[PDB]
Every structure is written in structure tokens, then in C-alpha cells.
Design an enzyme around this catalytic site. Structure first.
Site, PDB file in Angstrom:
ATOM      1  N   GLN A 224      20.917  34.919 -11.428  1.00  0.00           N
ATOM      2  CA  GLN A 224      20.886  33.724 -10.605  1.00  0.00           C
ATOM      3  C   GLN A 224      19.620  32.897 -10.711  1.00  0.00           C
ATOM      4  O   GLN A 224      19.617  31.720 -10.333  1.00  0.00           O
ATOM      5  CB  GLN A 224      21.161  34.070  -9.145  1.00  0.00           C
ATOM      6  CG  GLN A 224      20.349  35.218  -8.614  1.00  0.00           C
ATOM      7  CD  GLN A 224      20.477  35.350  -7.128  1.00  0.00           C
ATOM      8  OE1 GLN A 224      20.552  36.456  -6.589  1.00  0.00           O
ATOM      9  NE2 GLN A 224      20.457  34.222  -6.439  1.00  0.00           N
TER      10      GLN A 224
ATOM     11  N   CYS B 159      23.475  33.216  -4.967  1.00  0.00           N
ATOM     12  CA  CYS B 159      24.159  34.488  -5.110  1.00  0.00           C
ATOM     13  C   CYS B 159      25.558  34.374  -4.500  1.00  0.00           C
ATOM     14  O   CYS B 159      26.510  35.005  -4.966  1.00  0.00           O
ATOM     15  CB  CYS B 159      23.343  35.635  -4.497  1.00  0.00           C
ATOM     16  SG  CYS B 159      22.963  35.523  -2.730  1.00  0.00           S
TER      17      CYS B 159
ATOM     18  N   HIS C 278      22.233  38.684   1.213  1.00  0.00           N
ATOM     19  CA  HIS C 278      22.590  38.620  -0.199  1.00  0.00           C
ATOM     20  C   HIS C 278      24.084  38.857  -0.437  1.00  0.00           C
ATOM     21  O   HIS C 278      24.617  39.907  -0.087  1.00  0.00           O
ATOM     22  CB  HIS C 278      21.780  39.667  -0.975  1.00  0.00           C
ATOM     23  CG  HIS C 278      21.804  39.483  -2.456  1.00  0.00           C
ATOM     24  ND1 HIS C 278      21.555  38.267  -3.058  1.00  0.00           N
ATOM     25  CD2 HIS C 278      22.021  40.361  -3.461  1.00  0.00           C
ATOM     26  CE1 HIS C 278      21.613  38.405  -4.369  1.00  0.00           C
ATOM     27  NE2 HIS C 278      21.893  39.667  -4.639  1.00  0.00           N
TER      28      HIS C 278
ATOM     29  N   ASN D 282      25.843  42.911  -8.855  1.00  0.00           N
ATOM     30  CA  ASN D 282      24.795  42.013  -8.363  1.00  0.00           C
ATOM     31  C   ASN D 282      24.653  40.851  -9.351  1.00  0.00           C
ATOM     32  O   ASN D 282      25.373  40.787 -10.346  1.00  0.00           O
ATOM     33  CB  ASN D 282      23.475  42.787  -8.240  1.00  0.00           C
ATOM     34  CG  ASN D 282      22.548  42.228  -7.163  1.00  0.00           C
ATOM     35  OD1 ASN D 282      22.724  41.115  -6.689  1.00  0.00           O
ATOM     36  ND2 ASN D 282      21.547  43.005  -6.785  1.00  0.00           N
TER      37      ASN D 282
HETATM   38  C1  LIG Z   1      21.686  34.344  -2.410  1.00  0.00           C
HETATM   39  O1  LIG Z   1      21.272  33.900  -3.477  1.00  0.00           O
HETATM   40  C2  LIG Z   1      20.540  34.933  -1.616  1.00  0.00           C
HETATM   41  N1  LIG Z   1      19.389  35.345  -2.437  1.00  0.00           N
HETATM   42  C3  LIG Z   1      18.921  36.594  -2.475  1.00  0.00           C
HETATM   43  O2  LIG Z   1      19.441  37.497  -1.808  1.00  0.00           O
HETATM   44  C4  LIG Z   1      17.696  36.907  -3.336  1.00  0.00           C
HETATM   45  C5  LIG Z   1      16.430  36.421  -2.618  1.00  0.00           C
HETATM   46  C6  LIG Z   1      15.298  37.432  -2.419  1.00  0.00           C
HETATM   47  C7  LIG Z   1      14.420  36.970  -1.268  1.00  0.00           C
HETATM   48  C8  LIG Z   1      15.822  38.859  -2.170  1.00  0.00           C
HETATM   49  N2  LIG Z   1      17.670  36.600  -4.781  1.00  0.00           N
HETATM   50  C9  LIG Z   1      16.965  35.612  -5.343  1.00  0.00           C
HETATM   51  O3  LIG Z   1      16.258  34.818  -4.714  1.00  0.00           O
HETATM   52  O4  LIG Z   1      17.051  35.537  -6.741  1.00  0.00           O
HETATM   53  C10 LIG Z   1      15.798  35.595  -7.447  1.00  0.00           C
HETATM   54  C11 LIG Z   1      15.723  36.633  -8.537  1.00  0.00           C
HETATM   55  C12 LIG Z   1      16.469  36.492  -9.701  1.00  0.00           C
HETATM   56  C13 LIG Z   1      16.431  37.476 -10.690  1.00  0.00           C
HETATM   57  C14 LIG Z   1      15.635  38.617 -10.515  1.00  0.00           C
HETATM   58  C15 LIG Z   1      14.886  38.763  -9.358  1.00  0.00           C
HETATM   59  C16 LIG Z   1      14.932  37.772  -8.378  1.00  0.00           C
HETATM   60  C17 LIG Z   1      22.377  33.268  -1.647  1.00  0.00           C
HETATM   61  N3  LIG Z   1      22.846  33.782  -0.360  1.00  0.00           N
HETATM   62  C18 LIG Z   1      22.835  33.087   0.775  1.00  0.00           C
HETATM   63  O5  LIG Z   1      22.435  31.930   0.851  1.00  0.00           O
HETATM   64  C19 LIG Z   1      23.359  33.796   2.011  1.00  0.00           C
HETATM   65  C20 LIG Z   1      24.881  33.674   2.051  1.00  0.00           C
HETATM   66  C21 LIG Z   1      25.657  34.858   2.599  1.00  0.00           C
HETATM   67  C22 LIG Z   1      24.807  36.128   2.557  1.00  0.00           C
HETATM   68  C23 LIG Z   1      26.046  34.523   4.015  1.00  0.00           C
HETATM   69  N4  LIG Z   1      22.752  33.263   3.236  1.00  0.00           N
HETATM   70  C24 LIG Z   1      22.233  34.082   4.150  1.00  0.00           C
HETATM   71  O6  LIG Z   1      22.269  35.305   3.993  1.00  0.00           O
HETATM   72  O7  LIG Z   1      21.657  33.496   5.302  1.00  0.00           O
HETATM   73  C25 LIG Z   1      22.479  32.953   6.348  1.00  0.00           C
HETATM   74  C26 LIG Z   1      23.370  33.858   7.159  1.00  0.00           C
HETATM   75  C27 LIG Z   1      23.485  33.682   8.534  1.00  0.00           C
HETATM   76  C28 LIG Z   1      24.285  34.531   9.294  1.00  0.00           C
HETATM   77  C29 LIG Z   1      24.984  35.573   8.669  1.00  0.00           C
HETATM   78  C30 LIG Z   1      24.879  35.754   7.293  1.00  0.00           C
HETATM   79  C31 LIG Z   1      24.078  34.901   6.552  1.00  0.00           C
END
Ligand SMILES: *C(=O)([C][N]C(=O)[C]([C][C]([C])[C])[N]C(=O)O[C]C1=[C][C]=[C][C]=[C]1)[C][N]C(=O)[C]([C][C]([C])[C])[N]C(=O)O[C]C1=[C][C]=[C][C]=[C]1
Length: 215
Positions: free
Chosen positions: A19, A25, A162, A182
Site C-alpha cells: 500500500q 488498506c 487496519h 495483508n
Molecule cells: C489503512 O491503510 C490503514 N493503515 C494502516 O493500518 C497502516 C498504518 C500504520 C500506522 C500501522 N499502514 C500504513 O500506513 O502503510 C504503510 C506501510 C507500507 C508498507 C510497509 C510498512 C508500512 C486504511 N484503513 C483505514 O483508513 C481504516 C478503515 C477501517 C479499519 C475502518 N480507518 C480506521 O481504522 O479508522 C476509523 C475507524 C473508526 C471506527 C471504527 C473503525 C475504524
């Protein structure tokens, strides 16, 4: 016969993608379920466009975030999602550029799973195939995982941050597990995948934001 199903060895799953620095994600996960169903119906696997979702599902935040259900609703109301060669992943947000000709799939709605229901989730992955789930990935033990059935008493079922994709389940050796796909390149975990505990009381809240598109 073994109480297990692994969609990887059936042509239902595509190569592990990375990603990047974009919080898409949820786009990869959504698309992963769309590919599984495609294979089920048409019998042929094709790589769908996560970028197409990132730029077009206005209900979501793009690289900031989004829900899979919202992306599903989008492919149904827009009626079509491009393929990767039709709408490549640029690793960032940009103007929606849906190219109707490049359409490679359609969907007629979507179904959620009872919040906190692992039995029902097993049935879904067994009946429907690859389901889109969301878990707590904010944990170092999770990030540097390499092999085995992951379990950590601090994974918080309340912090789903995630999105990921269930490709099956099984028992590696004594331990029940969910086979997860993943989206952090194939250099992460076990060549892109990770086995997470199954039935050890809703581990990581794997069954709290599950859903599958209807095709
Ligand atoms: C995803 O992309 C979320 N991103 C990640 O989990 C991580 C971030 C890190 C801080 C762990 N990955 C990342 O940033 O990639 C970088 C990378 C690439 C390659 C190697 C290493 C690192 C998108 N997800 C969301 O936006 C989620 C959606 C669903 C889970 C709901 N949003 C979220 O969780 O927040 C809002 C929410 C509110 C209430 C209930 C659930 C979710």
C-alpha cells in the site's frame, strides 16, 4: 476431512500488494473480496484497481481512510470498477479517473457479518470466500510477525485501524487460525500473509467489521 479452506491454492487470490505511504488498506481489502467473487462467478482471476476506489469513493477519506462497505456501495451505484492496467495505483490521492471501458467487475450490494461473530465469519469465508475484515494492527508484535499463529492479549477489539482480507482458516498444529492477506508488500510477515488466532475470544476484533460484496 480437515475443517479448513485456503483460497490461495484455488486461484481466488491475487499477488500481495504494497500500500505504500497511503492509508488505502481499506481499498486493497475491498478489492480483494471483489477479486475472490469474480473468480467464483466468471472462473477467471483479474487484478482490480484499488486506486479506482481511493479517488472515487467520496464517502471515504482516500489515503486518510475508509470503510469497505462504502467502496462496495460505490461499485454497485457506479456499476463498474477498473482493472489495475486500466487504473494503476499511484500511491496517492488524485482526481477520480474511472475509465468505463476498463471496467472489469460489477457488484449488486453487500452483506455484513454479525458484529463479533466468529462462527458466522467462518461460515462466510467457507460459503462465500474471501471476506473483508478490519483489525487492530497498532501493535509491534503484529508488525514484526514472521511465522506461526499470532496471538497477543493486548490486541484491542475496540481499535480497528487496519483493514485486511480473510482467505481461509485452519489449524496449523493444534491452533485454530484465520489466514490473512495483508497489504504491506510480500517482504512483510510470511510473504505478505499472517495467521491470526481463531476462536481465542474474537482475537483482535477480526469479526467486528467484516463484510462481503454480493455478485
Ligand atoms: C489503512 O491503510 C490503514 N493503515 C494502516 O493500518 C497502516 C498504518 C500504520 C500506522 C500501522 N499502514 C500504513 O500506513 O502503510 C504503510 C506501510 C507500507 C508498507 C510497509 C510498512 C508500512 C486504511 N484503513 C483505514 O483508513 C481504516 C478503515 C477501517 C479499519 C475502518 N480507518 C480506521 O481504522 O479508522 C476509523 C475507524 C473508526 C471506527 C471504527 C473503525 C475504524
Amino acid at each position: 476431512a480437515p475443517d479448513s479452506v485456503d483460497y490461495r491454492k484455488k486461484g481466488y487470490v491475487t499477488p500481495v500488494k504494497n500500500q505504500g505511504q497511503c492509508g488505502s488498506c481499506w481499498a486493497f481489502s475491498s478489492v480483494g473480496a471483489l477479486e475472490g467473487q469474480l473468480k467464483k462467478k466468471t472462473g477467471k482471476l483479474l487484478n482490480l484497481s484499488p486506486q479506482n476506489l481511493v479517488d472515487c469513493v467520496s464517502e471515504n477519506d482516500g489515503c486518510g481512510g475508509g470503510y469497505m462497505t462504502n467502496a462496495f456501495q460505490y461499485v454497485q451505484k457506479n456499476r463498474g470498477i477498473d482493472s489495475e492496467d486500466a487504473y494503476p495505483y499511484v500511491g496517492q490521492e488524485e482526481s477520480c479517473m474511472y475509465n468505463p471501458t476498463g471496467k472489469a467487475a460489477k457488484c449488486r450490494g453487500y452483506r455484513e457479518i454479525p458484529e463479533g461473530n466468529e462462527k458466522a465469519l467462518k461460515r462466510a469465508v467457507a460459503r462465500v470466500g474471501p471476506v473483508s475484515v478490519a483489525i487492530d494492527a497498532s501493535l509491534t508484535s503484529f508488525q514484526f510477525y514472521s511465522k506461526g499463529v499470532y496471538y497477543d492479549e493486548s490486541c484491542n477489539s475496540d481499535n480497528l485501524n487496519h483493514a485486511v482480507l480473510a482467505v481461509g482458516y485452519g489449524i496449523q498444529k493444534g491452533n485454530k487460525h484465520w489466514i490473512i492477506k495483508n497489504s504491506w508488500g510480500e517482504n512483510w510477515g510470511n510473504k505478505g500473509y499472517i495467521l491470526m488466532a481463531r476462536n481465542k475470544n474474537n482475537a483482535c476484533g477480526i469479526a467486528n467489521l467484516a463484510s462481503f460484496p454480493k455478485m
